Design a protein around this ligand. Structure first.
Ligand SMILES: CCCCC/C=C\C/C=C/CCCCCCCC(=O)O
Lengths: 49, 49
């Protein structure tokens, strides 16, 4: 995802990602890891994959 | 800081998904998933930089 939406990967959130793409349940046991990947998943001209 | 009364609305806020991306979006007193299922009485917007 983009950086601003990493907050949406959490129980009880809303937004684009938390409603239309990826929803976590409220009674969620588990955990979330996210790291910036600008040097891998971004290229000049912009990845559109 | 600028205060703006808000009245006679319908709080769709899906239009904001198209363009604007918010770094922080924290809601106190309401869980954000319920913001579609509610009616808001005395709505003020306090804007600044
Ligand atoms: C005219 C200004 C708003 C008037 C209504 C006020 C409060 C109720 C609507 C609340 C939602 C605020 C916008 C959140 C947008 C989704 C953010 C996200 O999930 O990424």
């Amino acid at each position: 995802i983009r950086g601003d939406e990493v907050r949406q990967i959490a129980p009880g959130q809303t937004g684009k990602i938390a409603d239309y793409n990826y929803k976590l349940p409220c009674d969620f046991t588990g955990c979330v890891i996210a790291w910036n990947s600008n040097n891998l998943d971004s290229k000049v001209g912009g990845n559109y994959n | 800081w600028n205060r703006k009364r808000i009245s006679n609305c319908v709080a769709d806020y899906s239009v904001l998904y198209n363009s604007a991306s918010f770094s922080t979006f924290k809601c106190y007193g309401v869980s954000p998933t319920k913001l579609n299922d509610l009616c808001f009485t005395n709505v003020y917007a306090d804007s600044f930089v």
